[PDB]
Design a protein around this ligand. Sequence first.
Ligand SMILES: Nc1ncnc2c1ncn2[C@@H]1O[C@H](CSCC[C@H](N)C(=O)O)[C@@H](O)[C@H]1O
Ligand SMILES: [Zn+2]
Ligand SMILES: [Zn+2]
Ligand SMILES: [Zn+2]
Ligand SMILES: [Zn+2]
Ligand SMILES: [Zn+2]
Length: 413
Amino acid sequence: VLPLDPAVPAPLCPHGPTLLFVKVTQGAAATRRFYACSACRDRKDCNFFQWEDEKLSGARLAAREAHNRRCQPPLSRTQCVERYLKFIELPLTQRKFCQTCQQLLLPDDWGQHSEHQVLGNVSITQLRRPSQLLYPLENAATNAQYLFADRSCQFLVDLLSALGFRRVLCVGTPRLHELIKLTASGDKKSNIKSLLLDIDFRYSQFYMEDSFCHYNMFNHHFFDGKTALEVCRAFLQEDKGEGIIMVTDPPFGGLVEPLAITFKKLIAMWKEGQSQDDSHKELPIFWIFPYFFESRICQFFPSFQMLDYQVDYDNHALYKHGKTGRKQSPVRIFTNIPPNKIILPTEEGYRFCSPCQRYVSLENQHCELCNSCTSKDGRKWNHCFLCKKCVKPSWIHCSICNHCAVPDHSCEG
Ligand SMILES: Nc1ncnc2c1ncn2[C@@H]1O[C@H](CSCC[C@H](N)C(=O)O)[C@@H](O)[C@H]1O
Ligand SMILES: [Zn+2]
Ligand SMILES: [Zn+2]
Ligand SMILES: [Zn+2]
Ligand SMILES: [Zn+2]
Ligand SMILES: [Zn+2]
């Protein structure tokens, strides 16, 4: 029994309102309510823990509040915008970037970074590609910053163009953001705006207030307040809500329920003020995620189907290309956009499967008994008829269990 009440507000951690966890174990007869950190899995980075009954005293809470104020990024958002306007107006031979600090450098505070490792002659080309200048925060427990491979990212910007979107709400996709901006600015009158939402405050010194928001994705928190929140609200509400799509690449291993709750808050911002009669539209969404999360994702967004495009990364914890060659990427796209409207590059090994009106991989065989090109892995799958589905070729149909699974599994029933 959780008579859990959303009415009352969580305590505040450095990364915005904590989330409530409850443990049920040891016979499922005891409960424990506590507020943990919304966007840090292990306690090693955000060591927040408070029993719900536990109430902070005046002094102890003052300490908590000051600590939260202290853990904030060392530059205000406003300071970032001002430093940027001053930076892009220096000669090339005076644009420096400190790599040990991940900070753009104004000529006056070079001395403080003298004995650091500093990169010189930062061109505007680099400034408009921050994903290639800052090192990626690859820790799986906090950021999981795995950046798209150039080929796949260019595919995504081209797909968003051909579909006919002018605004792209980029929650957790820095590289896609920057490439959208470069395809809108250079050599094309195609207008595409992009609004990066991310917890990586390092991207604040590269985009002005209209293009970036310091944003926590697990609790729907704008670190800079209502001004930033309203930047986001206007970016959704523009053009009566038309011409907008939200692309997300959340950290692959993180809780997946609060993600859906945050995404639904965003959709709620987009649906406000829209015609009551015309309430049959949903906000077009790309949820980029490894394929084995489908069951969970479609449990929260019934209107989502999985495209067969293999999204490739420069770096990832799920696959790194071996000496034999390149291993395949488990990460796919999940959309409410009809997959028959989405055309995959035929020059990458992608063909249109007429039975399941959508594009599929070149090595993907079409299973005629669940009516879809079913081989998600790099191999050829098999169709079990008692489970009425296709399982990976290493799985077997177990007796007594009566459902498909690997040898060396736990038997049930
Ligand atoms: N709690 C959180 N709130 C907002 N953004 C977060 C977050 N946790 C991780 N992120 C961001 O989400 C991104 C996931 S890595 C995916 C990046 C994207 N595929 C690209 O290549 O451009 C990281 O950049 C990280 O900064
Ligand atoms: Zn430095
Ligand atoms: Zn097929
Ligand atoms: Zn099948
Ligand atoms: Zn079976
Ligand atoms: Zn079994």
